[PDB]
Amino acid sequence: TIDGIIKQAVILNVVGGGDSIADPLSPGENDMVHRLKRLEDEQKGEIIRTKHNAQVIAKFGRDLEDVYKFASREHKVGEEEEDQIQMLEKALRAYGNVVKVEGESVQKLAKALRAEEEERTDEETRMIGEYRDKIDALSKAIEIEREGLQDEAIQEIAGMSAEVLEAAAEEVPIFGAGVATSIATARAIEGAYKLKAVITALTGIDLSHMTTPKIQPKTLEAILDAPGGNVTDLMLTRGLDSKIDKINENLAEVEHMQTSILPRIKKAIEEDRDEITNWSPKRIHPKSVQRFRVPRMQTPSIHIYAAPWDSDSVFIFHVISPHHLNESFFLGFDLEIEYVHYEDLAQHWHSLGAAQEVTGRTFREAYREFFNLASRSTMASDIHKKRLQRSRMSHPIYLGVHNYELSYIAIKSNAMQLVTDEDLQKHVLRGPLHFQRRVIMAALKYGVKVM
Amino acid sequence: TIDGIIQGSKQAVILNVVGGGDSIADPLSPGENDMVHRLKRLEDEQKGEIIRTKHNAQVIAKFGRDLEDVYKFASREHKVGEEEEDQIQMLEKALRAYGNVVKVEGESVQKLAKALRAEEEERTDEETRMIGEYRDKIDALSKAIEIEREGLQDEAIQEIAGMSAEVLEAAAEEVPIFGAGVATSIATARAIEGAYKLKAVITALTGIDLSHMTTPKIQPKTLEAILDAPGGNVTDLMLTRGLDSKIDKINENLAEVEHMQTSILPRIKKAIEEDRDEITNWSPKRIHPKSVQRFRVPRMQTPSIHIYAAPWDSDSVFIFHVISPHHLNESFFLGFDLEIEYVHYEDLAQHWHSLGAAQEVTGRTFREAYREFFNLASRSTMSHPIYLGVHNYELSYIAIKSNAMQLVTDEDLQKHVLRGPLHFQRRVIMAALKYGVKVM
Amino acid sequence: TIDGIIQGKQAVILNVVGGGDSIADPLSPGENDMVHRLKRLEDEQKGEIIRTKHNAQVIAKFGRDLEDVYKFASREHKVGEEEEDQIQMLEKALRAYGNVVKVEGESVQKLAKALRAEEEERTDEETRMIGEYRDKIDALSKAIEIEREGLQDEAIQEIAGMSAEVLEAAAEEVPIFGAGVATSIATARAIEGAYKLKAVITALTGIDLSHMTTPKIQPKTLEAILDAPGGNVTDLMLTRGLDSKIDKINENLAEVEHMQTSILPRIKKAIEEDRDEITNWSPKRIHPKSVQRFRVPRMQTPSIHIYAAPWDSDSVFIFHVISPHHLNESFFLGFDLEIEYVHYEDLAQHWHSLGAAQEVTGRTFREAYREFFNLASRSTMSHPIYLGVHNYELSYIAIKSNAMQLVTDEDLQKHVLRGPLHFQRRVIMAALKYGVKVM
């Protein structure tokens, strides 16, 4: 229940190609980053499919094409009508199969990087060579970007388009090798074949959290850690271990869906046999699957809340972890009082959540303390104190959602640095207040490095 | 004219679904309002590719090859010389196709509505079937809304539920034309119109904006009835309230397209023949932009929620000017000064643009309306308002009017609306104008 | 270097909403980012229609090279022995881009030349072509006429509002394909985008080319239409817009020629130099390592770069507009709306790889913000907060001329600063990008 009271600094992210930030207090901008991401991923997928369909089928199996065809090409009726359970199983299996292939590739490269030099095979030597050539490009890019900064800057380290970022940053491209416009990542392949899209379409279960970042913050940090000097093989692993963390987190989610939730969906279909007009054993009726609806504010994302009074200095993050690790934390801000709150919380009791030992406080208990502790600060004006006291007896106003790309543990670690690292706290709050709020979001999602 | 006090200083829900549902915006943000339209167009174009690929044979079997002809002209073929398309024949084809799609939608809702308000014994086997299938979807929506309601904090103002477009179609769409109970395959009349670029081509050839001719993705009165019956099964009669709201909008759309065909189409034909000797290389097969500027509505007189700001630096003052479809040439004023807890309402006169049907000459000018508004507002500080832009609405004009009416008269509404950051309060007013809020 | 005091009828942004290029609040990093994201998605959807409708005619006119660049970008992926020579590709895409814009340029030149030629001197086809251009201008005039009497007594906003397809039909002087058929008009900007020419150059080299574009409407064309109310715009007056277009086309042509003669040879050199610095090096591949030599810092790209004050102020914003690399020029344009203050200053040339060398005059961007922030901070040394980028569509000279009117035209200064401050900032952006006309 941390109530910590708050040179060049860089957001560990790339603009253009990289994932977007938003002002936490702007519901519109947060909604639009998701809308734009979906439209951009759909246009990318057409290129992946056209370029690589034969090779995707050869590697991952025709199941991926089957899920794609069902999603957007064919609609079967009567006797030929698709078994939607068989479809749901197919899409879950395909998603898990794509991410496990990604994981194995990063594991192999990570293992090779921490395997002396003499001990490395010819192909281990080859593969580290190819990875280091890309890292050299990223290093030179970051070098040129760094001396372009003003004496006192708070901004993202670099700026490259998605195609340039894939060519330089993506460690283990599945197809597309060293041809720009042709690089096919596991995230691109999943999106192209609409694997998550179909799982969500059939079950109502949101899976936006099951993704990977386009660049690893710890990779960027290591490049800055070694200025001109070549980043150690060991230092590179930090980024690669962050990636495997997220991949394993994704794999555990899909396995939790297959072993825990899939059996109950099957059960629900047979139970509703006499509750549904023209019931079919081949169809998942929306009625049968509302059993597994998480409340919109309990999905695995950064949920943003505003103060119940007119304030642009107060915002609450409530970040929820994947369902299999049924965890969440509170991160509150009052920039007018230079105040930051952190707290670990209890587990939700929604259908999708895995059961844990019942420790931690309620989100409700957490916002009462946030407003309470704020009203006690010596820095607070008599007007502000009275507004915080009114808000405390009041409840926070839900704005919306902002999906995160790192592991839940890494977002937790990012939040921890925002509450404890006092050096961080003084390079973050500079410039227009609305700009400060974006920077806090960026610090929560990726991290900032001070120089 | 109605002028009350939005008293500032329970739970209140916006009758809309996030994700799948139509978007709101801060009225004072011109950028966000512009981008909701841009994003909607891009999302509808991606959806249309799936509708076309999955259903083209069945669309042609049901609505006729005219829809495919409009699509092909819009985005697949470009004919030249002797084979060059008669653009009037095209304009007629697209208007006819649009009208044919919406009349099929209307007939389906009518049939379901009629069945729902028929004695159980009186209902046919298929009427019993169809109400069964509709109720199964409503049960899903009810359970969804039930789970969503106990997730709310003690004091919340937000949208009732959150589901993706594909989940919302499966649970909310009463009369899917194709796609039955297969997610990713449900084809609505709104999806079919968009997929075949019917409005797109009418606008492209005439310059006439038709953004207003749409249907909502969920009926607010349907959501209201579900909340009206907590766990308890919504009455068949109660369900009709949403279905009647839908038929209102469909009939409103049908009257617009009929107004375009009988009133405006003849004058466009006339204008082409009149400009015979005013146009270099004139063709009877081409609609020249010169000939069709006669029918240009001023950008601020289109059927939408038009947003204006105060001529001084204020984030508390904003004016809605909502214009009805051209056939019902009506509009109203809805002014806000949140600093003074003030709301203005007023019915206004009819515009004299080409597209407007003539009415009896009552009501004050928009100019007369802002003078009073700004007079009261400037007391806190003649003034002319700053136009920000447009925000298209999905319900009937009558339902938006009714929504505006509740913002001026329902004092219980006024006290749950202005809470949190002022920018958030402005979005909530927009949401209340577009969909409505229910208090609990 | 000019420092003036902004002072304070109808005033109009010389742009069309819907179909026309977007503005943004300079102090909103999100809205600036999203206008670019939306533009790319809209251009990709448009390109599918251009390709499907016109592929045979594009190949007949410009050659199969355009289709080859498109196919490489989004349709095929060759491997092993059959793998594409990425240098041959880069040359092909640069050649194709240059070939499309030079065809556009020649068409505007021909129409411009005809418009200045005395009526008797004009050929039958010169008479035809001016007739067709004037019919479109009449449509634009009537559109603008109807739009003008819809304005309130005191209005500051864009002159007109039409969708892209309606704007192409009425405004685009020299459509390459699509003639007088809405949904079918193919501009050089549409054709370039459809065949992913710049997309592939950027994808292979990392060099941003967002600046190489044309506006969807010429501000000087709109100005001339307002200059002649009901009265027919003179042939000579129309040329002002047509000369602005040729300015931008020639600016684009000089950039691509600068890329081909100056930068392309060094990229080829860099590939051979890194022969022993790259694991599994190929003479057919452009490795990202080899092309970082030519990376412009993100804040030095040819765009309107926006900076905020290092303190909490919504009245202070700095434009730093950078010209195309071949004309290695830039200027500073600072605003403090709380003090009614505007700063202008010409600056020095950047020393990034892509910049053509000039004579070493002008002050540093750092020197420029020091003074700006000094005067501004008096209301409250300081370093500005970078927000992001906003690409411009007119010639660099025309944006410079637009900035000049914001600092010197005192009549302009009093119709711009009216209404909510956030709205005022958008209007300044609009005035910088297109211009405003007062009536």
Numbering used by the authors:
A (entry chain A): 47 to 52, 70 to 514
B (entry chain B): 47 to 55, 70 to 441, 456 to 514
C (entry chain C): 47 to 54, 70 to 441, 456 to 514
What did the paper state?
Bluetongue virus (BTV) is transmitted by blood-feeding midges (Culicoides sp.), causes haemorrhagic diseases in livestock and is responsible for considerable global economic losses.It is an unenveloped icosahedral virus, belonging to the Orbivirus genus of the family Sedoreoviridae, with a multilayer capsid enclosing a segmented double-stranded RNA (dsRNA) genome. The inner two capsid layers (composed of VP3 and VP7) comprise a core particle which remains intact following infection, whilst the outer layer contains two proteins, VP2 and VP5. VP2 is the attachment protein and protrudes from the virion surface, whilst VP5 is implicated in membrane penetration. Protein VP5 forms part of the outer layer of BTV, with two symmetric trimers of VP5 fitting like pegs into pits on the underlying core.
Here we characterise VP5 at two pHs by crystallography to provide a detailed analysis of the pH dependent structural changes and consider the consequences at the virion level. The structure was solved for the high pH form by seleno-methionine labelling, assisted by the contemporaneous release of the structure determined by cryo-EM and refined to 2.8 Å resolution. Crystals structures of BTV VP5 trimers at high pH and low pH show that at high pH the structure is essentially indistinguishable from that at physiological pH (Figs1 2).
